[PDB]
């Protein structure tokens, strides 16, 4: 349908994704989380199952940084979306932190091993960066934007 | 050649020693009430790494078990066998814990010299002589004439003679070595006969838990008198 095609094209364009399999992957994990939230809303308030399982779900989503720290209700967990998940991806986080000029530049950098998340370099652009780990995204020490060797085209030109 | 899970739960093996486990060779103590010397050396103490290293320890006269040199690797050493290593100058003793597993205890020569062994049976041997059989299958010729069944004996271990004995008593503290309440150091406070098989004792700990264990599974350790050093 044209609505599905235009929606998936807006996702693939707005966040520099490769195909629609990544969109369907995110929509599947989002539907799993939202199904768990609906099943926890089935029960009444102050049931211990709903209390502890909903607190676990909300603390998990706030810790992985999707759900905002302001709103912490299970209705907002139902109101979650795939734009929030693709915003929590690593590639859009490199683009928004401004190490790269565009989202396709960010995917290129993460593929050819320039950025690192915390200590180790990250080869995958779909790395779900958590909220505590959002700040420690920077260029690695072996990268010419970080330091070390001046690099490849630089070496061929400076010879 | 049993598997690591089919090995009993009281000589411990981690996720490390392969899927298989050594079987104890036939000897004084039983099969399911046993710690082999290889599990004592390289799986409990970790003075060794491999089977060949354990063999290179055992074959030279460096490990003595109950005061005699034990050469073969899977020699059974179940309960209260003093294990003297002279190059390290240590003597270990095997006791249990409150959960039901084997425990090792480091000690020197003064408590290493004697063994507290529970009498299995008294009889008249050949030559018209009374003899005494312990749980270590030690038979002592010409014993003291009051040492009856279920009494324990301080064996000399340099000559093997009797030195002292502790009587089966309601009011003497005891150690459990079997059953569903295994390894619980407490005091024998009651004993019920049940003639016709399988009599019991009722026993409480130091802090008021009564339970009924069988007179086979009991083991007398001392009235107060901890003649072996239970670990503090």
């Amino acid at each position: 349908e044209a609505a599905r095609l235009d929606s998936e094209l807006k996702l693939v364009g707005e966040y520099g994704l490769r195909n629609k399999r990544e969109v369907w992957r995110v929509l599947l994990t989002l539907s799993k989380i939202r199904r768990a939230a609906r099943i926890l809303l089935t029960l009444d308030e102050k049931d211990p199952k709903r209390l502890f399982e909903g607190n676990a779900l909300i603390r998990r989503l706030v810790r992985i940084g999707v759900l905002d720290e302001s709103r912490m209700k299970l209705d907002y967990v139902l109101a979650l979306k795939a734009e929030d998940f693709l915003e929590r991806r690593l590639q859009t986080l490199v683009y928004k932190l401004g190490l790269a000029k565009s989202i396709h530049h960010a995917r290129v950098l993460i593929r050819q091993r320039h950025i690192r998340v915390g200590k180790q370099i990250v080869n995958v652009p779909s790395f779900m960066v958590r909220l505590d780990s959002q700040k420690h995204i920077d260029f690695a020490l072996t990268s010419p934007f970080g330091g070390g060797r001046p690099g490849r085209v630089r070496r061929k030109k400076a010879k | 050649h049993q598997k690591r899970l089919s090995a009993p739960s009281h000589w411990l093996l981690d996720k490390l020693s392969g899927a298989y486990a050594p079987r104890p060779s036939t000897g004084p103590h039983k099969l399911r009430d046993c710690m082999p010397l290889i599990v004592f050396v390289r799986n409990r103490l970790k003075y060794a790494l491999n089977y060949r290293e354990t063999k290179a320890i055992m074959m030279q006269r460096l490990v003595k078990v109950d005061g005699k040199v034990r050469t073969d690797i899977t020699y059974p050493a179940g309960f209260m066998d003093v294990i003297t290593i002279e190059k390290t100058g240590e003597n270990f003793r095997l006791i249990y814990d409150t959960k039901g597993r084997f425990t090792v205890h480091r000690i020197t020569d003064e408590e290493a010299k004697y063994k507290l062994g529970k009498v299995k049976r008294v009889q008249l041997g050949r030559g018209g002589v009374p003899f005494l059989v312990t749980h270590d299958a030690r038979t002592i010729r010409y014993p003291d004439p009051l040492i009856k069944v279920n009494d324990t004996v301080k064996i000399d271990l340099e000559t093997g003679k009797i030195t002292d004995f502790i009587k089966f008593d309601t009011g003497a503290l005891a150690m459990i070595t079997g059953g569903r309440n295994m390894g619980r150091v407490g005091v024998i406070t009651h004993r019920e006969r049940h003639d016709g098989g399988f009599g019991i004792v009722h026993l409480k700990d130091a802090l008021d838990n009564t339970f009924a264990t069988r007179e086979s599974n009991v083991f007398v350790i001392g009235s107060e008198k901890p003649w072996i050093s239970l670990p503090k």
């Binding site: 799993k32 502890f52 676990a56 091993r113 690192r116 200590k119 080869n123 779900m128 | 970790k46």
Partner: protein, 123 residues
């Protein structure tokens, strides 16, 4: 008791929980994160290589057949650093635990308002 044990350690018990330095629980250049259960296993493998310091075979074909089949019969998923457990029998124990865990000054005012004739009338 899985969801209940994490509520005590983070909200109830006043003891700080060790967090890893950020890049350490990344498996293969980002291909997975090590969840706090899978990380705690990884020290247990490592803490067994200094005791008598014989090396290990990095899994085998018969363990990988088992543990990767455990994903086939479980509803767990690891969306980020955390685990997201299914709401089946793990949710019923939370109800199943909590049910066994739950198992002469007046007279003076009346005589003090019966003495005075009256205050007034309706305004």
């Amino acid at each position: 008791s899985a969801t209940l044990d994490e509520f005590i350690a983070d909200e109830v018990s006043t003891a700080p929980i060790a967090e890893p330095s950020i890049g350490t629980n990344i498996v293969k250049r980002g291909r997975g994160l090590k969840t706090a259960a899978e990380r705690r296993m990884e020290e247990e493998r490592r803490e067994y290589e200094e005791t008598n310091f014989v090396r290990l075979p990095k899994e085998s074909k018969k363990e990988r057949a088992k543990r990767a089949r455990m994903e086939g019969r479980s509803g767990r998923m690891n969306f980020g650093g955390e685990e997201f457990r299914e709401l089946g029998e793990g949710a019923e124990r939370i109800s199943r635990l909590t049910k066994a865990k739950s198992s002469g000054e007046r007279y003076q005012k009346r005589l003090k308002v019966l003495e005075s004739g009256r205050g007034t009338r309706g305004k």
